Amino acid sequence: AAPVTHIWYFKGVPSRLGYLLDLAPKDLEKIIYFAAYVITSVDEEMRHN
Amino acid sequence: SEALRQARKDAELTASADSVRAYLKQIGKVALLNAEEEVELAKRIEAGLYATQLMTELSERGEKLPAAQRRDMMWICRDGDRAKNHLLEANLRLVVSLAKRYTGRGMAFLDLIQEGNLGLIRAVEKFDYTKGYKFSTYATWWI
């Protein structure tokens, strides 16, 4: 019902998700295990003008 | 004074790999209620259900619904929904109150807590206030 991250690409060291997104793994765990939000998109031009 | 608040915040925002502890610390944010709060929330929820019911009354051609009636009816409905969610969010702690003692046989503990929460939704749905009993006395059965 809601997508999931294969653990081999998240908990391995180094974490391939961590690299392909360029995130700190201990700040990726808060992202995927529902411990801390993350801004996924933003409307740069609107916030600009 | 606030020096210990540094510890209280840093230790609050720590690793805590245990998902059980995570969910406990999560539910702990919203505080409990008392009788008048529960009564008024039940009234808000009933008002909200009747507002949405009357809206689907007007879903068929019942009126060119004016702007004022639209705005305050939508406010009524959204208030009912917010209060309904507020009530569950208040009593989640009770749900763990018991699930705490059906563990250790068969199932995990988060599973028991979620099943309790679903029953809690049923309980709030079917909860009456006019009988004037405390909420937990009626909710414990369904949980």
Binding site: - | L4, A7, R8, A11, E12, T14, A15, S16
Partner: protein
Amino acid sequence: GFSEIMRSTLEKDNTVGTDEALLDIYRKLRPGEPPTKESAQTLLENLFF
């Protein structure tokens, strides 16, 4: 009295007042918990005694 390294560390002990550490100990006793500086005293007199 004779305790050379003791007095040395007691000069670099960088923490004064009993309650002062009790909270050190606590805080590190377990991570992630609001201490009750007065109340965690029992935790100590309740691990070893």
